[PDB]
């Protein structure tokens, strides 16, 4: 199927309590494989997946140098951003950056991404053509002008279409057992009276991979989306994910309600019923 590689970077200023805290992580699809934390003792990019551990010393040395260089550049960014927005010295602010690439089934480049946020809001993003920028406010226009003058998009595009896709392909091959796998959700529904006239119906999906899934409740075939409590898909901790959806229903009406599960690992979408 389709695959993605993404790097996520977070830097947080802590004025008069040190330099900014920088955390970087990398993922293939929903599987983490590396981390760096600026506060940790090792000062190294570290493996977080068994299949990346075989990479030799040039990978670890070069990735540690590259990630430390990403950290420095966010340290500069935090100063520059406080100037652009006329913000005071004291308060903590957050810069986030994400970049990476998607490949299709043939593992050829499909789409590339490179986006920044400041204090939780879109700041500037490379557009789908990898040649132009979306800037979310006037401060981010200042960045856009500087990045256009410096031909940043061309250097990014070459990375995203080339190196990004090469390394993704490599990881998909070396970590095939983990990365090219689909685990179909184990599903069931539970039933519990909340009183003598109502019951919670909760539709469960367990032990699945990748994390993308859809769980929906119908009542006589009609979607119950406003009445459904849907929780955030969550890690089990073993490489698989879980999710549930619940509705509170009048006791006696259970057989009108059906849960519907869609997931790439299922040969067909499932309908679970109370009869």
């Amino acid at each position: 199927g389709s695959h993605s590689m993404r790097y996520f970077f977070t830097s947080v200023s802590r004025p008069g309590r040190g330099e900014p805290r920088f955390i970087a992580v990398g993922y293939v699809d929903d599987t983490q494989f590396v981390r760096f934390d600026s506060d940790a003792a090792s000062q190294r990019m570290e493996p977080r997946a068994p299949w990346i551990e075989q990479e030799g010393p040039e990978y670890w040395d070069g990735e540690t140098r590259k990630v430390k260089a990403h950290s420095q550049t966010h340290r500069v960014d935090l100063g520059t951003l406080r100037g652009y927005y006329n913000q005071s010295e004291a308060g903590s602010h957050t810069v986030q950056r994400m970049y990476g690439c998607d490949v299709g089934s043939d593992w050829r480049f499909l789409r590339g991404y490179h986006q920044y946020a400041y204090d939780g809001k879109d700041y500037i993003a490379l557009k789908e053509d990898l040649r132009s920028w979306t800037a979310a406010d006037m401060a981010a226009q200042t960045t856009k002008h500087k990045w256009e003058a410096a031909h940043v998009a061309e250097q990014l595009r070459a990375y995203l279409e080339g190196t990004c896709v090469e390394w993704l392909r490599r990881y998909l091959e070396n970590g095939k057992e983990t990365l090219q796998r689909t685990d179909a959700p184990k599903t069931h529904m539970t039933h519990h009276a909340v009183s003598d006239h109502e019951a919670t119906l909760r539709c469960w999906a367990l032990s699945f991979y990748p994390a993308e899934i859809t769980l929906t409740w119908q009542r006589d075939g009609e979607d119950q989306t406003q009445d459904t409590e849907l929780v955030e898909t969550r890690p089990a901790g073993d490489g698989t994910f879980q999710k549930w959806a619940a509705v509170v229903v009048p006791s006696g009406q259970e057989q009108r309600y059906t849960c519907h599960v869609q997931h790439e690992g299922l040969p067909k979408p499932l309908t679970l019923r109370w009869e």
Binding site: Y7, E63, T73, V76, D77, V95, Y116, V152, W167
Partner: peptide, 6 residues
């Protein structure tokens, strides 16, 4: 594996 200031 990884690959600019604002």
């Amino acid at each position: 594996x990884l690959a600019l200031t604002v």
